Amino acid sequence: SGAIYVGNYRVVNRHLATHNDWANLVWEDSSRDLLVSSTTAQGCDTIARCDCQTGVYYCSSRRKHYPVSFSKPSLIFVEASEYYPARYQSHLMLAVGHSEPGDCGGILRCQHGVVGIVSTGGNGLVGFADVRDLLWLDEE
Numbered sequence: 001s002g003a004i005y006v007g008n009y010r011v012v013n014r015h016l017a018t019h020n021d022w023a024n025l026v027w028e029d030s031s032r033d034l035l036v037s038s039t040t041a042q043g044c045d046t047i048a049r050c051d052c053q054t055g056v057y058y059c060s061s062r063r064k065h066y067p068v069s070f071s072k073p074s075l076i077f078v079e080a081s082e083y084y085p086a087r088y089q090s091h092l093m094l095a096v097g098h099s100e101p102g103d104c105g106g107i108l109r110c111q112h113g114v115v116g117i118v119s120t121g122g123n124g125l126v127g128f129a130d131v132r133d134l135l136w137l138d139e140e
């Protein structure tokens with residue numbers, strides 16, 4: 001689990017979005033596993049605007065933050081998970097690291113702020129859904 005809280009926006013994995021998230025929907029993309037909903041109180045997180053390929057992610061299944069190198073956001077084939085079938089996911093970054101289904105929502109962060117959230121796992125890789133292209137998160 002986990003979300004990004006930026007302004008009056010809540011960024012979550014689409015597959016973990018709640019009824020309240022859908023009832024307060026701003027934007028969702030199944031191909032990216034992202035959903036954004038509205039908040040009443042303002043959030044504590046800042047979005048990275050950058051092309052960093054190094055950062056740190058939170059892994060709930062180790063209760064540890066790991067420094068990782070990660071690929072730039074691409075269209076990647078993902079094998080079947082407890083929450084998705086084998087399919088192609090867009091705006092996905094991969095790193096070598098531990099990721100189980102419950103680790104989805106963990107933040108990846110660089111020196112500029114929040115890069116993305118854990119979205120995929122298996123075979124010793126962790127995949128993160130990028131949010132740095134979503135400039136509209138910073139306003140309105």
Ligand SMILES: NS(=O)(=O)c1cnc2cccnn12
Nearest residue numbers: 059060061062063064065066
């Ligand atoms: N490496 S860690 O201390 O962050 C850790 C590993 N396993 C647990 C269980 C509870 C709390 N912390 N914890």
Ligand SMILES: NS(=O)(=O)c1cnc2cccnn12
Nearest residue numbers: 001002058060105106107108
């Ligand atoms: N990725 S994070 O910095 O927001 C984080 C730190 N500790 C937890 C526990 C659950 C979800 N997320 N989380």
Ligand SMILES: [Zn+2]
Nearest residue numbers: 050052110112
């Ligand atoms: Zn950065």
